[PDB]
Amino acid sequence: ASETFEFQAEITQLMSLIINTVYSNKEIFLRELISNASDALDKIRYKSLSDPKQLETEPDLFIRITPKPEQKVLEIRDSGIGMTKAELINNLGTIAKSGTKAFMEALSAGADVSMIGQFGVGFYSLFLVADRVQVISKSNDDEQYIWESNAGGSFTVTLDEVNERIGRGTILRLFLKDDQLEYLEEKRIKEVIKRHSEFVAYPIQLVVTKEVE
Amino acid sequence: ASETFEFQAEITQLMSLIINTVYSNKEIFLRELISNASDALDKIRYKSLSDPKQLETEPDLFIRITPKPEQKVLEIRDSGIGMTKAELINNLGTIAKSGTKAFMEALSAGADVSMIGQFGVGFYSLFLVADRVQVISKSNDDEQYIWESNAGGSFTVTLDEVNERIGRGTILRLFLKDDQLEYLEEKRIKEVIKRHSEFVAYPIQLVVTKEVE
Numbered sequence: 461a462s463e464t465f466e467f468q469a470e471i472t473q474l475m476s477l478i479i480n481t482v483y484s485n486k487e488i489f490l491r492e493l494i495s496n497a498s499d500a501l502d503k504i505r506y507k508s509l510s511d512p513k514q515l516e517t518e519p520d521l522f523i524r525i526t527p528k529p530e531q532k533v534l535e536i537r538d539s540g541i542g543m544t545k546a547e548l549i550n551n552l553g554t555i556a557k558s559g560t561k562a563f564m565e566a567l568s569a570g571a572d573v574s575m576i577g578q579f580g581v582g583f584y585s586l587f588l589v590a591d592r593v594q595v596i597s598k599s600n601d602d603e604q605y606i607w608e609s610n611a612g613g614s615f616t617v618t619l620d621e622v623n624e625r626i627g628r629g630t631i632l633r634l635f636l637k638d639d640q641l642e643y644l645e646e647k648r649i650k651e652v653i654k655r656h657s658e659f660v661a662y663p664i665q666l667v668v669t670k671e672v673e
Numbered sequence: 674a675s676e677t678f679e680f681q682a683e684i685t686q687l688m689s690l691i692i693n694t695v696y697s698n699k700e701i702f703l704r705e706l707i708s709n710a711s712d713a714l715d716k717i718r719y720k721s722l723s724d725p726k727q728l729e730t731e732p733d734l735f736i737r738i739t740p741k742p743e744q745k746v747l748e749i750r751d752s753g754i755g756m757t758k759a760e761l762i763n764n765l766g767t768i769a770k771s772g773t774k775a776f777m778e779a780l781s782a783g784a785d786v787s788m789i790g791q792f793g794v795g796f797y798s799l800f801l802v803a804d805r806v807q808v809i810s811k812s813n814d815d816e817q818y819i820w821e822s823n824a825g826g827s828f829t830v831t832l833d834e835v836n837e838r839i840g841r842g843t844i845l846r847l848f849l850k851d852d853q854l855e856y857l858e859e860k861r862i863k864e865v866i867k868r869h870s871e872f873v874a875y876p877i878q879l880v881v882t883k884e885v886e
């Protein structure tokens with residue numbers, strides 16, 4: 461059973477701006493997702509300074525990107541802290557975010573969309589490039605859940621009986637728009653990582669499917 | 674809940690021979706799995722000659738190999754016909770197989786283990802290289818199930834709430850033995866495919882994880 465939740469009204473309004481935007485530097489979505497992944501990795505590592513047990517659900521600390529061209533999907537996985545059900549509900553849409561209005565007011569004054577991570581709302585940049593997202597997450601303190609949104613006014617949260625087990629962490633599953641299929645390509649991906657994600661403390665893995673010739 | 678089933682006695686005896694064998698040409702396990710994958714692909718394609726609907730759960734016809742080095746696992750996936758629960762139970766261990774005794778009698782006369790596919794029992798060759806297998810399968814006619822064995826006298830079958838959805842087909846998940854970790858390596862894999870699987874009608878995909886430098 462899927463519980464449904466309403467987005468706070470300014471978040472809806474923010475996704476609607478970003479979804480319907482001509483902006484020409486959309487690659488920054490990947491800088492934001494990598495940077496969030498790194499934040500989550502920092503938190504599990506930090507937590508484990510005084511609780512080493514927390515690392516054992518998933519000893520390896522990594523960021524992994526998996527294009528799925530046949531489904532038009534790009535997945536960004538991390539083994540960071542993960543989010544519980546209550547965390548997905550509170551933090552991904554139901555409660556007002558501090559920088560949402562301020563970011564939109566800056567945008568309409570001329571600010572580059574790039575500044576979105578500085579306003580602390582950079583997760584919503586994934587709608588530049590995607591018209592649907594699943595956030596699949598496994599916190600040490602809860603079962604695996606799927607949060608899903610298509611940028612309308614509500615999102616669902618659902619106990620995960622459908623995807624592979626994460627030992628610990630999060631998978632951002634993006635349903636790319638038809639004009640944004642360039643982020644399915646290996647060359648394009650490495651290039652965006654080189655430009656925007658030079659200083660990442662964690663290995664960044666790219667999963668590539670080759671045909672044997 | 675996992676139902677448990679008993680292997681027919683000669684199948685147990687066959688796995689026990691293969692598990693405990695010095696034989697020096699174990700790579701043939703991959704020839705057998707690829708060839709089984711191709712058999713399953715033939716059957717779905719054939720079925721769909723008079724029922725094109727059957728293809729739509731998974732339009733693409735492929736064999737995909739995914740080493741998972743960190744788990745010491747090798748997965749062989751196909752989008753073939755898949756097997757229902759009853760098929761996994763009947764065909765993977767509970768009923769006597771025609772070539773089981775005859776293959777063992779040949780083995781003890783001097784036959785190469787390679788002849789195993791000729792006796793129609795080549796699936797059990799995966800125990801040359803693995804001490805545990807999951808067969809995860811999705812037939813158009815049933816839900817996704819996991820069959821599991823560790824070469825003892827019984828196996829389990831379990832409704833799958835734990836792995837990614839197959840649209841249609843089968844994943845052979847092999848828990849490699851510590852001395853057989855060479856089949857985790859890309860170079861080794863392509864080499865075994867070149868030698869034994871030259872004439873396969875279907876694309877063979879290798880999934881490779883690279884670190885971005």
Ligand SMILES: C=CCNC1=C2C[C@@H](C)C[C@H](OC)[C@H](O)[C@H](C)/C=C(\C)[C@@H](OC(N)=O)[C@@H](OC)/C=C/C=C(/C)C(=O)NC(=C(C)C1=O)C2=O
Pocket residue numbers: 496497499500503538540541542543547551552580581582583584595629630
């Ligand atoms: C205020 C600083 C504290 N951290 C941050 C917060 C506030 C809280 C949400 C923190 C979270 O609370 C449970 C968690 O601690 C984890 C670690 C979540 C992640 C960082 C993210 O994913 C993973 N797991 O890869 C991400 O969703 C996938 C979250 C997106 C959230 C919003 C909306 C966002 O756009 N930007 C935010 C960033 C960037 C933050 O760093 C942000 O809001």
Ligand SMILES: C=CCNC1=C2C[C@@H](C)C[C@H](OC)[C@H](O)[C@H](C)/C=C(\C)[C@@H](OC(N)=O)[C@@H](OC)/C=C/C=C(/C)C(=O)NC(=C(C)C1=O)C2=O
Pocket residue numbers: 709710712713716751753754755756760764765793794795796797808842843
């Ligand atoms: C007698 C000729 C008919 N086909 C074969 C049979 C008899 C039946 C089992 C057929 C099956 O019935 C439901 C199915 O029709 C599908 C197609 C199953 C696959 C071919 C296999 O996997 C996929 N899906 O990749 C494989 O398990 C993973 C099966 C292993 C079975 C045994 C034990 C074996 O060692 N060798 C066999 C081979 C090779 C056969 O071709 C075999 O026994």
Ligand SMILES: [Cl-]
Pocket residue numbers: 556557558559
């Ligand atoms: Cl806030």
Ligand SMILES: [Cl-]
Pocket residue numbers: 769770771772
């Ligand atoms: Cl038979």
